[PDB]
DNA sequence: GCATCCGTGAGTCGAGGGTAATAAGCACAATTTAACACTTTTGTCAAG
């Protein structure tokens, strides 16, 4: 599944590149792990080889899957709760799962709100969280620095 | 009344020394304060 040098993202923390298989002592007999690394923050990670795909360790969008996300930004939207509580809740949830399409979509309707009616000091924080994570994986897939990715996102709008 | 508890005290002046760090949020109504426009007062000036 995950090979030594597979470049994949391990949400929520952000993008990074894995490293390899290890035996870390946990409970009983040592189970194989993916040592997974990250770019900026210096910390290691160990992801169970049992079910790494269902645990939230997923792949990275191909260089060809960018336009669908940029389009999920420019024109993209989604329904949001009325009460500010539940709204914040859902924003946090999508900012948890790590699903790139979902996060792009959320950022889409949220951003659509910031430029029209207005945005609170909460929903906007989460919005910027989304835009930043987007910048991370669009930087990782397209092999460009965060500047050009955030400039793709600023290309969507202006 | 006989052991066992709360209660109150206990030295003078000084010299310095010192400085510091927890906690939810968002829309909106109600005022407060800052801004601005302009009338009046008052102090100054040219010159009786």
Structure characterization notes:
The protein starts with 17 loop residues before the first strand and ends with a helix. A hairpin with a 6-residue loop joins strand 1 and strand 2 (31-36). Strands 1-2-3 form a three-stranded antiparallel beta sheet, with no helix packed on it. The chain has 158 residues and is mainly α. The protein has five helices and three strands. Helix 1 runs parallel beside helix 3, helix 2 runs parallel beside helix 4 and helix 3 (100-114) crosses helix 4 (123-141). Helices cover 43% and strands 10% of the residues. The radius of gyration is 17 Å and the shape is globular. It has helices at 66-74, 84-97, 100-114, 123-141, 146-156, and strands spanning 18-24, 31-36, 46-48. It binds one DNA strand of 48 nucleotides through helix 2. It is classed as transcription/dna. Keywords: protein-DNA complex, Bacterial transcription initiation complex, transcription-DNA complex. Crystal structure of T.aquaticus transcription initiation complex with CarD containing bubble promoter and RNA. The protein: CarD-like transcriptional regulator. The organism is Thermus thermophilus JL-18.
Helix content estimate = 40-55%
Counted by DSSP, the helix tally is: 5
Class by helix and strand content?
mainly alpha
Order of helices and strands: EEEHHHHH
| Computed Rg | 17 Å
The neighbouring-strand order within the major sheet is: 1-2-3
Shape: globular
Relative strand content: 5-15%
- Total E-strand runs: 3
Largest sheet: 3 strands, antiparallel
N/C terminus separation? 40 Å
Organism: Thermus thermophilus JL-18
InterPro entries: CarD-like/TRCF_RID (IPR003711), CarD-like/TRCF_RID_sf (IPR036101), CarD-like_C (IPR042215), CarD-like_regulator (IPR052531), CarD_C (IPR048792)
Pfam families: CarD_C, CarD_TRCF_RID
GO biological process, one term: rRNA transcription
């Amino acid at each position: 599944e995950f090979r030594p040098g597979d470049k994949v993202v391990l949400p929520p923390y952000g993008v990074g590149v894995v490293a390899g298989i290890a035996q870390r002592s946990v409970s009983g007999v040592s189970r194989a792990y993916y040592q997974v690394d990250f770019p900026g923050s210096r910390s290691k990670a160990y992801v169970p080889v049992e079910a790494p795909h269902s645990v939230g360790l997923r792949k990275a969008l191909a260089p060809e899957e960018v336009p669908v996300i940029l389009d999920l930004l420019k024109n993209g939207r989604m329904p949001l709760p009325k009460q500010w509580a539940a709204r914040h809740r859902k924003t946090s949830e999508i900012l948890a799962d790590g699903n790139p399409y979902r996060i792009a979509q959320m950022a889409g309707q949220l951003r659509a709100w910031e430029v029209e009616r207005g945005l609170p000091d909460l929903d906007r924080q989460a919005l910027r969280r989304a835009i930043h994570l987007l910048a991370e994986e669009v930087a990782q897939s397209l092999e460009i620095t965060v500047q050009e990715a955030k400039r793709l996102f600023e290309e969507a709008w202006g």
